Design an enzyme around this catalytic site. Sequence first.
Site, PDB file in Angstrom:
ATOM      1  CG  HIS A 229     -13.839   6.519 -36.794  1.00  0.00           C
ATOM      2  ND1 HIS A 229     -12.902   7.021 -37.669  1.00  0.00           N
ATOM      3  CD2 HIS A 229     -13.345   6.748 -35.548  1.00  0.00           C
ATOM      4  CE1 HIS A 229     -11.897   7.552 -36.939  1.00  0.00           C
ATOM      5  NE2 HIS A 229     -12.114   7.413 -35.639  1.00  0.00           N
TER       6      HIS A 229
ATOM      7  CG  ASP B  34     -13.883   6.181 -40.933  1.00  0.00           C
ATOM      8  OD1 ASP B  34     -14.196   7.360 -40.722  1.00  0.00           O
ATOM      9  OD2 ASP B  34     -13.613   5.387 -40.026  1.00  0.00           O
TER      10      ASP B  34
ATOM     11  CB  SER C  92      -9.946  10.253 -35.942  1.00  0.00           C
ATOM     12  OG  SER C  92      -9.134   9.555 -34.991  1.00  0.00           O
TER      13      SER C  92
END
Lengths: 120, 259, 28
Positions: B43, B99, B205
């Site tokens: 992502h 992910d 992230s």
Amino acid sequence: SLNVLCNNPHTADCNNDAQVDRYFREGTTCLMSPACTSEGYASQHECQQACFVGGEDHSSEMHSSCLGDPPTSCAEGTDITYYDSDSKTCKVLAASCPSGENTFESEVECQVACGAPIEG
Amino acid sequence: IVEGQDAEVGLSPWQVMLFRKSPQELLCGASLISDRWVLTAAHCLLYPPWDKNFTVDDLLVRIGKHSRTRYERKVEKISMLDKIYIHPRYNWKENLDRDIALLKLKRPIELSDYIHPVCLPDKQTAAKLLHAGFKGRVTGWGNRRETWTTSVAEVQPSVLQVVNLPLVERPVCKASTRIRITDNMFCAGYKPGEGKRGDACEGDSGGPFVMKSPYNNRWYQMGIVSWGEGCDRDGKYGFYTHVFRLKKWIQKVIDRLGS
Amino acid sequence: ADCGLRPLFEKKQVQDQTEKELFESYIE
């Protein structure tokens, strides 16, 4: 991590809660969509304060090296990438020797090191 | 990293800032699985709902940094990529299953005192370390709070940050979010009343969630910082891509390039 | 080495502050 709170669950109807207007980051910014008082955030600011990376403060990357004197055309000079304090950009002087630390090993590396807009 | 702390120089040689060409900004973080490859959360590059589809002609990978902004003259080894591979079964629309994504650095990194690879886990290593209660280390250049007032106590960290978070029981993770949880995502964080806080946040992230082995003494990377409901929120936990489950893939990807 | 070994620590044989925590948590 992906702040899932940002994405509006678009839940049918808040049972023991209210469908108040909340802001959820969509596309490239926070926009008010209706939702449950807990879902999302309550302020154009709050959402952009929690759904974006916000890396936009005093990230003064312009290293001291950038402000050094440009390479000089030297006898046994090579290609030397440097930051041009005039053009606010990085260039390459051929047949040159380093007059200090204003010598980077590549166009990109330089651009970031001195914050000059990176190109291709 | 919420409630984390400044990381010692060279503490995380596999950290890979994932930089963005123009604007020159910080997009994510990631691990260096090998001088050639970089492992990051999918992502980070692909998430349509937020106008997010990054092509190799936008990403720069500054590796081996420590301070968040300032260029570290002879330490960080900047780099451009070559190929971007995301898991085909990447469910961004629902609950970000798988992910994971692999970034092929253009020129194999010159391994050094600050740039060094982790070790992907394998059954043995995994089986012994993946039990709830056991802590882990999450390190990223993210913000310190979810929301704040006038940069109180300064939100954005000066240097890399660290925080050892213990893994929680799956039944607890499942039971803490409306969101669907799959077997390709474990969760970690403190429970309420546990005393210790701490959790990744916007800007981490991709960060590697590593765990040191008590046997062969190697630092393994078990999860990639994936998704979460706010930062440090009581009653909520961070979800990390389960590397091991996806190991088979990581291999499938690299081996196809040649030999 | 072949992987996961920090020069400035495991090689050098020095442990970082927050390292001991990860070990104590292995009580199992």
